[PDB]
Amino acid sequence: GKRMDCPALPPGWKKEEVIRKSGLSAGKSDVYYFSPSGKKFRSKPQLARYLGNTVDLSSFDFRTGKMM
Amino acid sequence: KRMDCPALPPGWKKEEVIRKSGLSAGKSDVYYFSPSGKKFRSKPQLARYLGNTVDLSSFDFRTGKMMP
DNA sequence: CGGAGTGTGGGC
DNA sequence: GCCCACACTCCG
C-alpha cells in the first residue's frame, strides 16, 4: 504493498511500510518513500540529499512520516 | 576462466564474472559448476542440489572457502 | 545487470 | 541489545 501519501512531505510523495517475510530479520519493517516521479528512497539522509533545501527535514521522523 | 575450488569435492569449479556496466559496474557474480557442468548461482540452489551429501553450513559462496 | 528483500555492523 | 543506513544476495 500500500502506497500512502505522506502529508508532512510535498505533493505526490508516498510512504510504504514493508514487513520482512523471512530470515533472521522477519517481522521487522522497512519504510520506503517514493517521489512523485516514482523513485525509491530508503533512508532520511538519502531523502535529504535529493530534496536539499526545499524541505526542512531536521525534525522529520523517517519511520512514522511525521514531523516532531 | 574456470578455477578448481578445493574446499568442495573433487572436480567442482568456481567462476567469477565482473559486471561491465550500469549501477553495479565493477561488482562480480560468482558461479559454480559441478563435475557435470550444471551451473549454480546461489548457495540455496547449490545446497538444494547437494542435499545432506555435502555440509555447506560454513561455506561462503562468494570466496569459495569454509570460514570459522 | 537490476532491485526487492534480507544481511550487516557501527554508533548509540 | 537495538536500529539506521546502506551492502549484499539471488533469481528474474
CATH of the domain at B24: 3.30.890.10
How is residue B65 written as a grid cell? 572457502
> Which residues face B60 on adjacent strands?
B65
Closest nucleotide to residue B17 (Cα to C1')? C1
Closest CA to B34 of B57, B54, B58, B19: B54
The rounded distance, in Å, linking the Cα atoms of B3 and A3 is: 47
The rounded distance, in Å, linking the Cα atoms of B29 and B32 is: 10
Query: What's the Å distance between residue A68 CA and nucleotide D12 C1'?
Result: 41
Task: Please answer whether residues B61 and B54 qualify as being in contact, where contact means their C-beta atoms are separated by less than 8 angstroms.
Answer: no
Q: Please tell me what resolution, in angstroms, this structure has.
A: 2.3
Q: What are the strands of the beta sheet with B28-33, ordered from one edge?
A: B3-4, B13-18, B28-33, B39-40
- Nearest residue by alpha-carbon distance to C1' of D10: B42
Class of residue B30 by CB neighbours under 10 A (exposed 0-12, middle 13-18, buried 19+): middle
Question: What range defines the domain where residue B66 resides?
Answer: 1-68
- Nearest residue by alpha-carbon distance to C1' of D4: A43
The rounded distance, in Å, linking the Cα atoms of A5 and A15 is: 6
Q: Which residues, other chains included, contact A68 with Cβ-Cβ below 8 Å and sequence gap of 6+?
A: A59, A60, A61
Give A41's Cβ-side CA count (13 Å radius): 20
The rounded distance, in Å, linking the Cα atoms of B10 and B35 is: 8
SS3 state of residue B60: strand
Query: What's the Å distance between residue A59 CA and nucleotide D3 C1'?
Result: 18
Residue A36 one-letter amino acid: P
The rounded distance, in Å, linking the Cα atoms of B33 and B29 is: 13
Number of domains, chain B: 1
How is residue A12 written as a grid cell? 505526490
To which residue does cell 511525521 refer? A66
Task: Please answer whether residues A65 and A6 qualify as being in contact, where contact means their C-beta atoms are separated by less than 8 angstroms.
Answer: yes
Distances (CA, A) of B51 to A11, A24, B41, B42, B57: 52, 22, 16, 14, 12
